[PDB]
Design an enzyme around this catalytic site. Structure first.
Site, mmCIF file in Angstrom:
data_model
loop_
_atom_site.group_PDB
_atom_site.id
_atom_site.type_symbol
_atom_site.label_atom_id
_atom_site.label_comp_id
_atom_site.label_asym_id
_atom_site.label_seq_id
_atom_site.Cartn_x
_atom_site.Cartn_y
_atom_site.Cartn_z
ATOM 1 N N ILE A 1 0.837 -1.191 0.000
ATOM 2 C CA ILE A 1 0.000 0.000 0.000
ATOM 3 C C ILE A 1 0.872 1.241 0.000
ATOM 4 C CG2 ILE A 1 -1.730 1.344 1.260
ATOM 5 C CD1 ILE A 1 -2.722 -1.396 2.435
ATOM 6 N N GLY A 2 1.895 1.234 0.850
ATOM 7 C CA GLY A 2 2.850 2.328 0.931
ATOM 8 C C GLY A 2 3.831 2.141 2.077
ATOM 9 N N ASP B 1 0.579 10.880 16.925
ATOM 10 C CA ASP B 1 0.746 11.197 15.499
ATOM 11 C C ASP B 1 -0.620 11.374 14.843
ATOM 12 O OD1 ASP B 1 2.069 11.736 13.127
ATOM 13 O OD2 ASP B 1 2.454 9.638 12.635
#
Ligand SMILES: CN(C)C(=O)c1cccc(Nc2nc(OCC3CCCCC3)c3[nH]cnc3n2)c1
Length: 255
Positions: A8-9, A132
């Site tokens: 996906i990344g 985050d």
């Protein structure tokens, strides 16, 4: 064991792949190979902490795979068919369509529930802070319910809370500041402070000024988002104070 569909990344923690067990999932590839014994031990501790979190609006943990040959801890988690909130925001910009207030209230309600489970563990449990919180870490299921994920292990506010600016530890109100930035950005389709450098950005934050969210949105919603952007952490609402807001109703809890 599982089958890899594709990558996906790559996040700051490592690569994320779409996988299939034929249940579709993802795993996060945490490479412990450059680590000392001590560092690996910290990793185990954090992963064990995060592993315990359970909530309909938190990306669900499923399993862990220790692959010694690849020197990699694979963390198997819920796949979120709807993508991330970042893409919703970029979509609104492209279509020149603001998000409906109803959708914003659903996101605010569900993210606040997710953070509530973290800040106020329902199960005894050690407190966790997300650390985050930004649109890229907020995922969506098929019905566009919120799934908070990728827990923390620019000229953008997300990487400058007033706590950072003042050398004070990241705390639960630092999560709330990020939530404020995120919800602001969902409404305005731009973050509340924009700049070309950290110095210029710090200046803008330190003034604590920004435009009202669009007049599309009620005074009440503008006010609670603004409250999360107070410079003083003790002026920001806790998750309980957010959920007490009159705007937040039963149907905002799940679509
Ligand atoms: C960039 N992005 C969010 C996507 O390509 C996408 C599109 C459709 C569905 C999903 N679905 C998904 N994506 C994830 O992580 C996305 C990945 C993380 C590292 C930085 C680049 C993007 C997930 N983590 C846990 N459950 C997830 N479900 C992702």
């Amino acid at each position: 064991d599982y089958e890899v569909l594709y990558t996906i990344g790559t996040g700051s923690y490592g690569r994320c792949q779409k996988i299939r067990r034929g249940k579709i999932l993802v795993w996060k590839e945490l490479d412990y190979g450059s680590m000392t014994e001590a560092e690996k031990q910290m990793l185990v501790s954090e992963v064990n902490l995060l592993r315990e979190l359970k909530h309909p609006n938190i990306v669900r943990y499923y399993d862990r795979i220790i692959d010694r040959t690849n020197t990699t801890l694979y963390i198997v988690m819920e796949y979120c068919e709807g993508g991330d909130l970042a893409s919703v925001i970029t979509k609104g910009t492209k279509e020149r369509q603001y998000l409906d207030e109803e959708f914003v209230l659903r996101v605010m309600t569900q993210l606040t529930l997710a953070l509530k489970e973290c800040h106020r563990r329902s199960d005894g449990g050690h407190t966790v802070l997300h650390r985050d919180l930004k649109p890229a870490n907020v995922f969506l299921d098929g019905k566009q319910n919120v799934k908070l994920g990728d827990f923390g292990l620019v000229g953008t506010p997300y990487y400058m809370s007033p706590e950072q600016m003042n050398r004070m530890s990241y705390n639960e109100k630092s999560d709330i500041w990020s939530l404020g930035c995120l919800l602001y950005e969902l409404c305005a389709l731009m973050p509340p402070f924009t700049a070309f450098s950290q110095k210029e950005l710090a200046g803008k934050i330190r003034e604590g000024k920004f435009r009202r969210i669009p007049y599309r949105y009620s005074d009440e919603l503008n006010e609670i988002i603004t409250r999360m952007l107070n410079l003083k952490d003790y002026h920001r609402p806790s998750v309980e104070e957010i959920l007490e807001n009159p705007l937040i109703l039963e149907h905002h809890h799940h679509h």
